[PDB]
Symmetry: C3
Subunit: 652 residues, 3 copies
């Protein structure tokens, strides 16, 4: 009898309801009443073990009963997060058991909480753990140390590869993937001992840094939905604030890819102000709240839940993050969120059946490029010679395509389907993916042979998965690229690649690559060096430019040339069938989606000026369905104000 989320569910707007001792019945009722009046249907509650434990060690559920009963009274469904006892100062929760004894305390917590709260008819989902993964993994603790020792003994690694060269085996990184898989699957199995009825959910976080911890295809085996925390103040450090549209779109695409056939939703969005908390503190504008909800729904999200409706009262984040003001009335952020909840109720059929319009462009990242980069840059936090270049590179291509109004997937390489017979009009972008193995190179050969277009820039494929450079021993991509690297020469943080005949002046970052072509067509620069090539490989094509041009775009804060070059390489079908911009627009984004056979476009202007965007491609005439600052169109030229969000319905 519990409702099960699906790809046909009506999306919801929701908020964390922060429950701690000291709150009154009257305060909590005020929150649920305003939450229901704000067109929110869902809340999330942290089921703190600390606030159910009695002196004698029995479980007292009264604090959480009070909240579940008020949610039920106001017809609000609950996402219940399993959060066992931990220090009051531990804001995010522990990520693994400390010890075998602690594992047994967690077993007991799950037994007690799931057996009790599974009986409430307004329970919508169990969140297995808050925010799996951390930059500070507990290798000091006995539980983790023992698990890592056992894992190493069950794996058979050599210090040399088949040809006899030294290798790195990345035991720690490969263990951490398996360790997350094990603990999340164990938590799922524990819940399922007591409740087989309710959805299981989890919220990976800080995905542009922690994606190397996460094996989403394995997690699909035990989840009913994938979530995510995407907080502007913690997770978007690689972007300026005016590009948090791009950051949220990439974060949504990354989760959507991880989810595969499962529905996804954004478990945490920033609902309010940073006083002392956050790395990049802000108070989201009402305009930002609208931008984030639409970007997520346009990327197939089945929900957006804000951290938080109400604030914590003591120490860390006291009076921070809240959508309500200190009088428990609506901020401009809650008023904005309420307009989106209202829009959904008035447009149920459209909003329940959203499918992202895939351009056929996939930007791929792999765990192994991140792991090899961490070994080579020895943890430096400065450019290409720092942690993060292997994620900033593909995010920069993502930004360039967003400013061209083109959708792009953002996927771990294992989430891409390499099993099809035809890849005509499909495109893969491998931007500074410095580690590729023989198995993945065979998949890319098959993809291109069957009509795929491959774009590769930066140090893509310089190393294999053992940090062995085939560029030195015998280049594994020679066959596919129809060419061979000659040299990298370090330059300044920003330099220009000036193509022969002035066809392009591409900003580039740090390293200039030169190559020698065999089967590929060489592209020369004005200094007479070969800096790029195009290989015809079976029915498909490869464009290779071994200088970092996506990081060059990032460093110059100018994506226009990267946009123009990328558009010139795209199959005609992509530009004919997908609405996009007639040219590059700085600080504008568009993404299109379909619902029940009708096409829609989402447009957001993040520039300081009114913009007239000329939309070309696909079919139909613009009908403005949503526009929070009175945008207007003349033919398919959209006039859109700073910070405005527009939804166009494409008619016949």
């Amino acid at each position: 009898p519990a409702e099960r989320i699906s790809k046909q569910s009506t999306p919801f707007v929701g908020a964390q309801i922060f429950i701690e001792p000291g709150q009154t019945q009257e305060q909590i009722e005020q929150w649920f009443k305003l939450l229901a009046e704000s067109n929110m249907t869902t809340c999330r509650i942290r089921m703190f073990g600390k606030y159910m434990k009695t002196p004698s060690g029995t479980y007292d559920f009264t604090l959480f009963d009070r909240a579940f009963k008020l949610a039920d009274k106001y017809h609000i469904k609950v996402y219940a997060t399993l959060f066992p006892d931990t220090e009051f100062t531990d804001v995010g929760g522990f990520k693994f058991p400390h010890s075998r004894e602690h594992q047994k305390e967690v077993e007991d917590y799950i037994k007690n909480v799931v057996s009790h709260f599974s009986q409430y008819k307004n329970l919508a989902a169990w969140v297995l753990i808050n925010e799996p993964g951390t930059p500070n993994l507990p290798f000091n603790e006995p539980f983790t140390k023992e698990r890592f020792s056992d894992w190493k003994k069950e794996h058979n690694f050599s210090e040399y590869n088949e040809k006899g060269y030294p290798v790195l085996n990345f035991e720690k990184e490969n263990f951490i993937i398996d360790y997350h898989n094990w603990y999340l699957n164990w938590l799922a199995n524990q819940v399922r001992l007591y409740d087989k009825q309710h959805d299981l959910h989890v919220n990976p976080h800080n995905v542009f840094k922690l994606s190397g911890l996460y094996d989403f295809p394995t997690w699909r085996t035990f989840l009913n939905s994938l979530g995510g925390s995407a907080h502007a103040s913690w997770h978007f450090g690689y972007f300026p604030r005016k590009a948090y549209t791009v950051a949220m779109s990439a974060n949504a695409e990354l989760i959507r890819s991880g989810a595969g056939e499962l529905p996804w939703l954004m478990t945490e969005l920033q609902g309010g102000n940073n006083l002392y908390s956050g790395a990049n503190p802000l108070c989201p504008t009402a305009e930002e709240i609208i931008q984030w909800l639409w970007i997520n729904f346009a990327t197939e999200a089945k929900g957006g839940i804000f951290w938080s409706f109400n604030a914590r009262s003591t120490a860390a984040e006291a009076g921070e993050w809240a959508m309500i003001n200190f009088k428990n009335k609506s901020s401009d952020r809650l008023i904005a969120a309420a307009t989106i909840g209202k829009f959904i109720t008035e447009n149920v059929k459209m909003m329940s059946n959203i499918k992202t319009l895939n351009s056929g462009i996939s930007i791929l990242y792999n765990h192994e490029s991140m792991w090899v980069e961490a070994a080579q840059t020895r943890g430096k936090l400065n450019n290409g010679r720092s942690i993060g270049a292997v994620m900033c590179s593909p995010l920069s291509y993502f930004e360039a395509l967003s400013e061209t109004g083109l959708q792009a997937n953002f996927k771990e390489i294992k989430e891409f389907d390499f099993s099809l017979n035809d890849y005509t009009d499909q495109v893969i972008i491998l931007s500074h993916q410095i580690a590729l193995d023989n198995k993945v190179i065979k998949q890319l050969e098959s993809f291109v042979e069957k009509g795929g277009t491959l774009i590769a820039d930066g140090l893509t494929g310089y190393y294999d998965y053992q940090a062995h450079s085939t560029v030195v021993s015998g280049f594994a991509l020679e066959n596919l690229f129809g060419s061979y690297p000659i040299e990298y020469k370090i330059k300044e943080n920003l330099f220009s690649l000036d193509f022969e005949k002035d066809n392009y002046k591409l900003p580039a970052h740090l390293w200039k690559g030169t190559i020698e072509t065999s089967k590929a067509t060489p592209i020369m620069d004005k200094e007479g060096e070969c800096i790029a090539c195009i290989n015809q490989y079976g029915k498909g094509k490869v464009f290779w430019i071994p200088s970092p041009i996506a990081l060059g775009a990032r460093e110059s804060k100018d994506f226009s040339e990267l946009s123009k070059l990328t558009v010139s390489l795209l199959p005609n079908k992509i530009l004919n069938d997908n609405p996009h911009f007639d040219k590059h627009y700085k600080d504008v984004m568009m993404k299109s989606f379909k619902s029940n056979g009708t096409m829609y476009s989402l447009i957001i202007n993040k520039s300081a000026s009114v913009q007239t965007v000329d939309i070309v491609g696909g079919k139909g005439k613009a009908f403005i369905l949503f526009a929070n600052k009175n945008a207007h169109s003349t033919a398919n030229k959209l006039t859109i104000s700073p910070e405005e969000t527009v939804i166009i319905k494409w008619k016949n």
Copy 2:
């Protein structure tokens, strides 16, 4: 006690609020110095109108191989001081590593405590017999940013303290709390060790004054319970070194830094006399955080600021230099030929002025405007928990002290005195607070008890000015802004939101096109009983509550930090003056308008009023002095200042004393 403490006092001087102030210097004594070198120092010190020296009684340089005490090195120095009629402040400094410049702050172990007992017995029993001993300094510079929680003595003391205190993880209403056990222990631990050192000295000498020099006060004030220290001291001192302690200020505002440091120590002293135990006397080569060599002009500025703030002395670190490793040939007032620098010549003019003006200089009482800028330990502790030790700025350690120092600077540039006091040092027991003003600037932690004291203060005619996140938290880091605002009654209003902005933004008021620099966070409120003040966006950003006979001005944006970030205190000056009771502006000499980089402070001696004026601007200034009564007579000026009818013409870096006739 009066006739009894006079029989204890014996032939030793007892410092008092009527003592003649002195100028003095550290005499640095270490092995290898010759009789002839040491005599040269005392002779020049006496000829420079200095009457006092301070000597570090190094345990290291008295300990013999067998463990007995040899006093010869210090006897030689005390005898030469006595020959030249120089009195000695003797610092208790037990044996420690040669590389430990400042000295240990607590015993390392029970065994170490017994070595310290033995040191005190030997040194006090011997040197108490010299007729030129003026004071015992119980410990050099109590307190440190790096407290030794790793060491067994401190670890055990903290364990015992926690067992004797009963803290709950929840408050009366049931909310989670922080108890700040570490910070509350550290207060009690400093109180305990200093009181124990006093008790040890008093076993062997009940005649001589006990003294101590708290240091780096804008950072370490959260370690110091001055009202408790009054129980066992005869005088409070201080180290105020331009190169270590004034990092929150540029050099051109070290006048303001020294005035604030003097006001902070004066407040801590209460009924006890105070003096500045350490002022910077010379050059930083490799030492110091903000290195300098004080100008002759800075030496004169610092001595007058301290005396105008009731100091009974100024002692310079140092007359002569250390010779080996850390600070070798640094900090000295004498040059490498053992002759006067321009700093010693300048200090000598102040010693000479005192001898020619004894009655005036012995009876200085600061002219209290009635403005008190209040800080509390708990705001500093809560800030340290919330900013997780970040070291920039409102989101960093130090905002809770920089905010009140900014108000202090704004008032200095208006020529108005202000007290700078820990909230426990403020007298909340009076029946009438008409024409008194309290400024609570970003004092983020206030408890129910202190809010009741503020309600009483305002009800009885007090004016309360509150800016920044004042009262956002209680003493357990619980925000009543979230649970039910404890200042709603007093403020007649309730916070609505904080929204983070840039480091510097403008508050643009609805009326008069009026603009205030603000830092980092914009506060909005809803008024009940208070009168709202709106901004151009139609949000309420401030209010005035009329509460009994007094008033409250509340602006929950940081406008003092806004003034600091913009490097412009003029608007904060104008706003504060507009909120002051008329009596303050009528009775106190002040500037007719704000003067950037000028300061004035007034004081009284035997019924005559005086003003101290210092110009730190790059230009000659004509300052129009208004308020109080009398005609300007220039008593002191080091660059030929002149007045025409209370308009003073004062040169860059000049220090002026006006006598009001």
Copy 3:
């Protein structure tokens, strides 16, 4: 006696490169490297004799991987410098600097026995490198072998906490132990090799010398070496310089090693041959022009070789595909083409190139270990760049060195114990002591003797403020009063950059501290503020110029060496300016150094400015003939027109 030539000061210099040998490489790849190395006019390679790649499971030594490389070297007539490199973690790029334990010392004994006994039999072995890059900033005081050695050393030394006069002192036990510990381990490695091979040269490569010179006792090392080497990598070792002054850095590094070598020949064991991808502190890819500059600077400073790290690249993890002179197709980069031109020049000019003697101007810039140790105690490890940071006691003398380079004057760069203070006459000799903050009574007596016998002494900054125990005689009774004929009065801290304006009309940039003095016998020099800021003392036949403000660090901070150049030239004996070719005036970003071979004088000129320069050369005798120029330089009389990044050799004809 066996087949290998023994290096000497008359050896023909060579160009060479590291050949990086690891498992996985094919016979065909390795042959391609040696063939191209021989075709590039290189005669020498260096090979890291990795213990890891000779150790078998059972603990026996299998030499096959290295035999293959030695046999291909021999086939192409390439001689080998073999570096002793015992087993260590794959991630340990540089190698361990001392044994970890007594048990580890025995494994190293066994490694040396096996490797030296076997490879000593190859006729193309030229040298044993005793250890790669002795010295580290992070000495292993935590490990049992080092801990025990330091305990024993302290028990055998008897230090007092007070000096003779009774003042407290520092004794720098750690620093003094580290000198003796390097001396001991290198001498022990030499003795171990000599158990099995008395025939081949022993070599070692000190590194990062502007930071690690305080670890190195070169005069002791001469007792067990046949040659001194050095690693001088633009991406690791030249942090104190901008890239446009790596000419000055390499010349100073060469002078420092040349001084250390004394009567031994020296060569540069490691020069940067290629690109930094992820490695290096100051990453670059050397230009062809930089390769030519570095080889000529070293040869002009008496180097008997330049070996590049590396010919070919490592393949896995740290430095994979980095540092290589060949490209990823195993063909010549523009760096290898440039190096080949120098190897070809040597073969066509053997008699000249085999007999190079640097033309000593008579100027010696002196540094001492003790100034570096005292600075480390006083700055408590601060890294803020300036006088109040680690490195000022080396940056100060390097700044004087740069000022003299831009005047076209040679200068020695020597540890004070490497200077010969035993001569009877120092007429027309000059010593520069720039911010050498620690001097003891023994060295002051040597300086008194030097000046008395006709020497000129230039002292700036805090020179002589402290003695070797960090005790300031400036405070207790100034030990240099007699020599300087004057006494310090005050130091007053100022801004990072201020001006010293003489009453008569030098305006010298100065850094951080202004010193004032009182003269007795010396002639005072007053500034425009009426303060005495410097003096000239006539002492016996010589003179002293003392300016206790840091004017070399002032030049560095202002990026302007012109005033320091003009002042220094005005103080030099006439004979130096008459007998040595130099520039008629200061030239920013140009350098010249002169040398002699078999009675003929030559000059090396390099232009590092952005523009073509016409340099007027004066002093010495003869007419300029351009022997080498890589960008078509020309001379008219003795005015050389030289392009940006060009290296020129002039032969002086008369």
